[PDB]
Amino acid sequence: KVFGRCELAAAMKRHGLDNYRGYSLGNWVCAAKFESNFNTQATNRNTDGSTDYGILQINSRWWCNDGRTPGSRNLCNIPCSALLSSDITASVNCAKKIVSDGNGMNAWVAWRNRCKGTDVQAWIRGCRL
Ligand code: NA
């Protein structure tokens, strides 16, 4: 599923991401834009052999099982394929664990490089929330 911007904003807010660990909704929408272009089916191979899955490009190195990432963990206790669903529940639940791990949203390098310190409220502009 390719979400609309406000469509994803509504879904993330419903699932309790607005101000989760102090991060406003626009931070999460901005992260999803640059990680996945709002596409639930996005997959990208990392140089270390791990893969990033779904709207928030969650890494098989720590967070989900894809069976092809040696020495990796599955800390969200989910198959990485569950992070590609049109229903973002699994991605959101797993993102709550990632952002709680100590470095907040710096875990998403695209958030740090492209969203951090920017006018992230622009990403929820015009949305009926
Ligand atoms: Na894994």
Side-chain angles (χ1 to χ4, degrees), residues 59-67 69 72-74 80:
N59 190 345
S60 63
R61 169 61 190 91
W62 293 106
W63 305 107
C64 59
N65 179 61
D66 67 7
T69 311
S72 72
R73 309 286 293 281
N74 179 10
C80 295

Side-chain angles (χ1 to χ4, degrees), residues 104-120:
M105 287 190 78
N106 295 293
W108 290 271
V109 166
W111 179 84
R112 184 167 56 78
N113 287 330
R114 301 183 76 172
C115 302
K116 181 179 190 182
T118 78
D119 181 13
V120 291

Side-chain angles (χ1 to χ4, degrees), residues 41-88:
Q41 301 196 253
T43 65
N44 293 288
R45 204 74 189 257
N46 303 132
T47 67
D48 70 0
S50 66
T51 304
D52 286 353
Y53 296 88
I55 53 162
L56 286 166
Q57 290 293 96
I58 289 173
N59 190 345
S60 63
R61 169 61 190 91
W62 293 106
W63 305 107
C64 59
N65 179 61
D66 67 7
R68 57 125 76 153
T69 311
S72 72
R73 309 286 293 281
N74 179 10
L75 291 173
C76 297
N77 300 122
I78 49 161
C80 295
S81 68
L83 300 174
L84 305 183
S85 172
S86 46
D87 180 333
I88 68 161

Side-chain angles (χ1 to χ4, degrees), residues 23-36:
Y23 289 95
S24 70
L25 192 56
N27 284 284
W28 297 105
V29 175
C30 183
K33 170 70 175 177
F34 295 128
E35 287 295 0
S36 70

